[PDB]
Amino acid sequence: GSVAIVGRIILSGDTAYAQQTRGEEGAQEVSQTGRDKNEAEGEVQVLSTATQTFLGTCINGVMWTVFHGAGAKTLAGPKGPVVQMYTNVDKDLVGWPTPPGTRSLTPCTCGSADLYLVTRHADVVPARRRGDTRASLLSPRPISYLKGSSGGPVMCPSGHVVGVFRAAVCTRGVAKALDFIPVENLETTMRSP
Numbered sequence: 026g027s028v029a030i031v032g033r034i035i036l037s038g039d040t041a042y043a044q045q046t047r048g049e050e051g052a053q054e055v056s057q058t059g060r061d062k063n064e065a066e067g068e069v070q071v072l073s074t075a076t077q078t079f080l081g082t083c084i085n086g087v088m089w090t091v092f093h094g095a096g097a098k099t100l101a102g103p104k105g106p107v108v109q110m111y112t113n114v115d116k117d118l119v120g121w122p123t124p125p126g127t128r129s130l131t132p133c134t135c136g137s138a139d140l141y142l143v144t145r146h147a148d149v150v151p152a153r154r155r156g157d158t159r160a161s162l163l164s165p166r167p168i169s170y171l172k173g174s175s176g177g178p179v180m181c182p183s184g185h186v187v188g189v190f191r192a193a194v195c196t197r198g199v200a201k202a203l204d205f206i207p208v209e210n211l212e213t214t215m216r217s218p
């Protein structure tokens with residue numbers, strides 16, 4: 026089974042919109058055959074396997090997502106399934122060559138502490154950065170609000186990408202903070218010998 030693109034999260038600065046591109050049947054077919062003839066576009070994709078769904082974020086020519094969503098699976102593409110370029114279980118990180126037609130977000134170099142997560146439902150969730158990999162939510166959220174958004178982007182006010190959403194700091198079913206793979210750690214992954 027392959028990972029399939031089933032939609033994209035269109036970013037328009039302050040707001041986002043979730044556009045579905047595959048229904049359940051089409052999604053399953055793309056994952057089964059590993060072949061996807063739709064011309065992809067955008068920077069944030071909605072991804073699905075046979076059993077799960079989550080997000081992927083295009084950065085530095087690679088579409089990144091979480092290992093706990095994609096495993097080591099191939100990505101369905103126009104020429105057939107595409108093997109993962111990066112697979113790091115320790116970081117819960119995987120990457121494929123960015124699908125043709127997509128574009129990459131720019132890594133943030135402005136150091137702003139005011140961040141926002143874009144969820145799979147196109148919700149924008151403000152957060153305040155707390156160290157390298159964490160950001161505290163301005164408003165607590167039920168975990169169901171954030172489920173399915175692993176692999177989505179954490180952004181700065183200028184529309185730069187700061188990190189890739191990995192996990193929620195969550196007790197008693199309420200998320201208080203975000204854990205994300207910082208963009209600098211993606212560059213390290215692309216530099217690791």
Ligand SMILES: CC(C)(C)[C@@H]1NC(=O)O[C@@H]2CCC[C@H]2OC/C=C/C(F)(F)c2nc3ccccc3nc2O[C@@H]2C[C@@H](C(=O)N[C@]3(C(=O)NS(=O)(=O)C4(C)CC4)C[C@H]3C(F)F)N(C2)C1=O
Binds near residue numbers: 080114173194
């Ligand atoms: C309690 C909780 C919120 C469920 C949990 N918090 C939590 O563990 O907090 C601690 C303390 C602060 C950071 C974190 O340190 C531990 C690191 C965990 C990890 F992430 F690195 C991780 N590495 C793995 C590597 C290999 C195999 C499996 C792995 N499994 C992992 O974590 C698991 C999964 C991850 C998850 O749910 N991610 C999200 C999501 O949407 N997934 S998903 O799309 O629906 C779906 C399941 C389809 C793919 C974004 C959060 C959303 F729900 F908000 N988890 C549990 C959590 O977030």
Ligand SMILES: [Cl-]
Binds near residue numbers: 158
């Ligand atoms: Cl990391």
Ligand SMILES: [Zn+2]
Binds near residue numbers: 184
């Ligand atoms: Zn920035």
